[PDB]
């Protein structure tokens, strides 16, 4: 089995700018290398193949070289639509083996996050759940630390948390958080507070509702 | 009865990891917060963290996120704290904890604690010597010395514990990367040398039990 | 992190009469805190729980007060057998945390030691090594000294001394006192003598023992 | 052995007024009483020697007093300069035996630190280790809470903080605190913080740098 | 001139000895007792003894007898305390010192100290590294010098080979995995730096070292 080893598990640069990503291959496979994108979500694309020729559809930006044993795939005017993982491959031995892959990452100013609290629906009240949601959208960097208090107590249980990956319209960060109680404990309590941590300030972002 | 077990003491050489143990009985295992908290020598506590053994759902001291690692055996009933990349600040005092709430009142508890000890030297017994008074008082004190044990920690007793009044235990000193401590207790002179006194040493890390009678 | 702050590192009282700690938070805690006492070589033991509340077993005279950020433990008709460190804790916030604990003292009269002292055994000859012990039991105040002197003359070199806490029974103090030395070495004097400089006398409490 | 027994560890005064030290032995010792000063890595100097006479390059502003058990040292018009640990000696018996030593403690008004922080440089990421230092000079009081962030995820392992005494001119503190990691541990991160916590302002001081 | 010199700093296996010495110069060096302090680290002072350097006549501290022998060489005006069956609690400062009434006033002369350290480990020279402040501007500019992982104490810090003293910190030396780091700051105005060479000069006698690290912008 030949080994296709990715230097590197993420490539940063700039909107505008270039990037290039490199394979290593443990025996000699000539010039039969591919190269592929996969955005989150989705099927994987083929970019290259023959290590060089690019697949219709594929724009120049994406330029391919290599032969034997180093190859390289380089993305030239880099922009937020690019952000994906992209894996190499060889197709000149059997069986055929893919890369680690390398997510591409874009370097941008700070942004502070929107931040929008959401009490239980009525429609969830009605099955014995109480799920409160925070949305924190478009930050940067994506580092960010929230934490729930109820009437002052904070509350780390009982929580779910998601990170989008990298915005593929402005290269920001999104995060949804919701904590869930039972109806009672719920109704056992007035202030429902989400509070967060970033960077771009010293003070929370505090985002609160009483259900009085 | 409700009871957390921890061994005594842990040896663990610098870099490598060791696994704590607190082994739950006389209770429902997965219906309690199951705690575990640091005390380094002469130190104060610190919250390590929290784990429900239910789900295994954690809470932890983010000080201790990436050195301690928490986990649960619920076929055997059992909690685990790993230590992984010892240092020397990583020799302490663990102990494991629980609170119960039964509707009525509200009881904690705790395990003995583990005495971990992060150090390259290897295990070395205690030598036990008793202490008995010159030749030729209404009241008579008697001693043992307990010299050039590691690590940490051994217990002394008196007569298996029947003897606790009149007993003076000494903290233990280190010198050359070996412990001393003594131990003294005060009788009336109608008990000794009538009567046996006997001083119990047990040090679990080299599996040690010394009885040292004090012989006139 | 909230901080707790207990003020005093020592707090004092005489046997029978009362002792308050206090402890600080950085942040209103409401009255999610929590109190500990934890005697020496022992387990630590909960007190008070939700800043007022006693935990099952723990007697009346342990009482808890306080909200949002000044609280205080006071500890009443207190006995010898509350000597330990006294230890605040926060857990309505994340991370827990603890203060930094008050260790109880009791003031009572001073008290001379019981001097002993103790030639080898000769179970430790076999050895090659000779240690002397001295015991200074029950005196008060700690502050203490000890000197030996081999053959009349100070000998301060290889000597191990150790301090007990105050003692739960009576509030007083011990000290053991080693002097250690090679078996050639002991043989190769005569006179072995133990001085205890304490308060209590102008003169200090000599015992002494020949080898022969 | 003679006993020399200065009560107290510390002594505390405004700059240019005035501090006493005592002393107290433990027998009679007549006036046979030293005093010396010294400074933070100096060598000790005499300043008082048969209890009330100064060696030569003292000031008047230091007076010794005292005979047999009791004996006093005084400082008038003290100033910063004046910071430093005191001790008392006796040489009437044999052997010489020194006070404990007391160190001058100088009050004045709050002070916030000035907070630098520098990234780990270029040399000494050669050597496969890097450090980020963290200044925080001339605050009073000497309390002070220094904290990393390595991307807003506090980090204590690794950190040495050090801190001096109390300033010769300004009566001041100052504290140096060091974030040593690895060269590679390093390079996984970004942005690297140091946050100041001290009772002059309620917002903390936030010193930071990227890659 | 009045002068004691010593060595700055002596590694010693434990077990071993040690002789420091006590050069002398400047005054006639057997018209004085020679006394000497030892001071541990963060610790008051001690009185080990005395040795007149006319006969070699000595007063000892009971304490140090077996411990330190004092000697004298009249022929390079040198004392020496010899200190043997080094321990853990040997590693301190042994000063020198003299007192002198010459018929008008009374001066005591000090020598510079010996840092005595007693422990296994070998001697490892500090590394510099300058603190320059980043690209990423006000009328005054923080530098500083980064001492690390050294072996034994001390070092000695200056700017500028002396010439800059106001605004500068140097920091006590703490004490990790065996090995010492201190560091060191000085603040000069904006129009010095970096127009201005601005130096941070290192000494570390047990290992011999003398590192001129200069901030370069
Ligand atoms: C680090 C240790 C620690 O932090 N803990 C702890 C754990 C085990 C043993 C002892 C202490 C705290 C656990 C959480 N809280 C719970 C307080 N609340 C109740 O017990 C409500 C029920 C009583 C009622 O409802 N009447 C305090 C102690
Ligand atoms: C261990 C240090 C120590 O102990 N010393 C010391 C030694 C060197 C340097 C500093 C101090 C003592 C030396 C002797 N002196 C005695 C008082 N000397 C005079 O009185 C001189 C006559 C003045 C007059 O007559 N006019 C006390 C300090």
């Known amino acids: 089995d030949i080994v296709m080893t990715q230097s590197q598990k993420f490539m940063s640069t700039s909107v505008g700018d270039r990037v290039s990503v490199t394979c290593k291959a443990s025996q000699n496979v000539g010039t039969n290398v591919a190269w592929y994108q996969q955005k989150p979500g989705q099927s994987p694309k083929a970019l290259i193949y023959s290590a060089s020729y690019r697949y219709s559809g594929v724009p120049d930006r994406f330029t391919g070289s290599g032969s034997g044993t180093d190859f390289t795939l380089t993305i030239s005017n880099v922009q937020s639509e690019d952000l994906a993982e992209?894996?190499?491959?060889?197709?000149?031995?059997?069986?055929?083996?893919?890369?680690?892959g390398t997510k591409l990452e874009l370097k941008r100013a700070d942004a502070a996050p929107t931040v929008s609290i959401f009490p239980p629906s009525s429609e969830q009240l009605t099955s014995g759940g109480a799920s409160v949601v925070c949305f924190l959208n478009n930050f940067y960097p994506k580092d960010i630390n929230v934490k729930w208090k109820i009437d002052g107590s904070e509350r780390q249980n009982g929580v779910l948390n998601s990170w989008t990956d990298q915005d593929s319209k402005d290269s920001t960060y999104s995060m949804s958080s919701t904590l869930t109680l039972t109806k009672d404990e719920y109704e056992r309590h007035n202030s429902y507070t989400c509070e967060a941590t970033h960077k771009t300030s010293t003070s929370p972002i505090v985002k609160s509702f009483n259900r009085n | 009865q409700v009871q957390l077990q921890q061994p005594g003491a842990e040896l663990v050489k610098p870099g490598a990891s060791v696994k704590v143990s607190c082994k739950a009985s006389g209770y429902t295992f997965t219906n309690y917060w199951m705690y575990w908290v640091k005390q380094r020598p002469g130190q104060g506590l610190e919250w390590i963290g929290r784990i429900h053994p239910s789900d295994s759902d954690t809470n932890y001291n983010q000080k201790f996120k990436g050195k301690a690692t928490l986990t649960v055996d619920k076929s055997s009933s059992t909690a685990y704290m790993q230590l992984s990349s010892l240092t020397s600040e990583d020799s302490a005092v663990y102990y494991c904890?629980?609170?119960?709430?039964?509707?009525?009142?509200?009881?904690?508890?705790w395990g003995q604690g583990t005495s971990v000890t992060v150090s390259s030297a290897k295990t070395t017994p205690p030598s036990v010597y008793p202490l008995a008074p010159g030749s030729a008082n209404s009241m008579v004190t008697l001693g043992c010395l307990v010299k050039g044990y590691f690590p940490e920690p051994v217990t002394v007793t008196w007569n298996s514990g029947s003897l606790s009044s009149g007993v003076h235990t000494f903290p233990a000193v280190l010198q050359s990367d070996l412990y001393t401590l003594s131990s003294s207790v005060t009788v009336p002179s109608s008990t000794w040398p009538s009567q046996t006194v006997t001083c119990n040493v047990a040090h679990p890390a080299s599996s040690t039990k010394v009885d040292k009678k004090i012989v006139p | 992190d909230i901080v707790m702050t207990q003020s005093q590192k020592f707090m004092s009282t005489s046997v029978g009469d009362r002792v308050s700690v206090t402890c600080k938070a950085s942040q209103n805690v409401g009255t999610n805190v929590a109190w500990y006492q934890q005697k020496p070589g022992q387990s630590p033991k909960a007190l008070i729980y939700s800043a007022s509340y006693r935990y099952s077993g723990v007697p009346d005279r342990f009482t808890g007060s306080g909200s949002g950020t000044d609280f205080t433990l006071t500890i009443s008709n207190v006995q010898s057998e509350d000597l330990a460190e006294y230890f605040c804790?926060?857990?309505?916030?994340?991370?827990?945390?603890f203060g930094a604990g008050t260790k109880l003292e009791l003031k009572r009269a001073d008290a001379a030691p019981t001097v002993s002292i103790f030639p080898p055994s000769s179970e430790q000859l076999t050895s090659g090594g000779a240690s002397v012990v001295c015991f200074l039991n029950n005196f008060y105040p700690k502050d203490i000294n000890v000197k030996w002197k081999i053959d009349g003359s100070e000998r301060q070199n290889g000597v191990l001394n150790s301090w007990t806490d105050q003692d739960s029974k009576d509030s007083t103090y011990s000290m053991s006192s080693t002097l250690t030395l090679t078996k050639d070495e002991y043989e190769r004097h005569n006179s072995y003598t133990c001085e205890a400089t304490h308060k209590t006398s102008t003169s200090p409490i000599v015992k002494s023992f020949n080898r022969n | 052995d003679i006993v020399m027994t200065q009560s107290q560890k510390f002594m505390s005064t405004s700059v240019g007024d005035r501090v006493s030290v005592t002393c107290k032995a433990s027998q009679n010792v007549g006036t046979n009483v030293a005093w010396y000063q010294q400074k933070p890595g100096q060598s000790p100097k005499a300043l008082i020697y048969s209890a009330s006479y100064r060696y030569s390059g003292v000031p008047d502003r230091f007076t010794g007093s005292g005979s047999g058990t009791d004996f006093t040292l005084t400082i008038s018009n003290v100033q910063s300069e004046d910071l430093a640990e005191?001790?008392?000696?006796?040489?009437?018996?044999?052997?010489?035996?020194?006070?404990?030593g007391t160190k001058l403690e100088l009050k004045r008004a709050d002070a916030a630190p000035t907070v630098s922080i520098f990234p780990p440089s270029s040399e000494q990421l050669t050597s496969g280790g890097a450090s980020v230092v963290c200044f925080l000079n001339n605050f009073y009081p000497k309390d002070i809470n220094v904290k990393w962030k390595i991307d807003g995820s506090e980090r204590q392992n690794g950190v040495l903080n050090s801190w001096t005494d109390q300033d010769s001119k300004d009566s001041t503190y100052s504290m140096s605190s060091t974030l040593t990691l690895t060269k590679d541990e390093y390079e996984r991160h970004n942005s690297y913080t140091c946050e100041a916590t001290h009772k002059t302002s309620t917002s903390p001081i936030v010193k930071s740098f990227n890659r | 001139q009045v002068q004691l010199q010593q060595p700055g700093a002596e590694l010693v296996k434990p077990g071993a000895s040690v002789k420091v010495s006590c050069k002398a110069s400047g005054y006639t060096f057997t018209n004085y007792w020679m006394y000497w302090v030892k001071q541990r680290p963060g610790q008051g002072l001690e009185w080990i003894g005395r040795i007149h350097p006319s006969d070699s006549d000595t007063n000892y501290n009971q304490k140090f007898k077996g411990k330190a022998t004092l000697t004298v060489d009249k022929s390079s005006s040198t004392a020496y305390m010899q200190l043997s069956s080094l321990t853990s609690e040997d590693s301190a400062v042994?000063?020198?010192?003299?007192?002198?009434?010459?018929?008008?006033?009374?001066?005591?002369?000090?020598?510079?100290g010996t840092s005595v350290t007693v422990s296994s480990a070998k001697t490892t020279p500090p590394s510099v590294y300058p603190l320059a402040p980043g690209s990423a501007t006000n009328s005054m500019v923080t530098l500083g010098c980064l001492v690390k992982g050294y072996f034994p104490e001390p070092v000695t810090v200056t700017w500028n080979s002396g010439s800059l003293s106001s605004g500068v910190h140097t920091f006590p030396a703490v004490l990790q995995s065996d090995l010492y780091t201190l560091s060191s700051s000085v603040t000069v105005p904006s129009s010095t730096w970096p127009s201005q060479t601005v130096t941070c000069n290192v000494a570390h006698p047990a290992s011999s070292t003398k590192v001129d690290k200069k901030i370069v912008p």
């Open positions: 904890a629980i609170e119960i709430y039964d509707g009525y009142n509200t009881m904690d508890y």
């Open positions: 804790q926060q857990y309505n916030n994340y991370p827990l945390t």
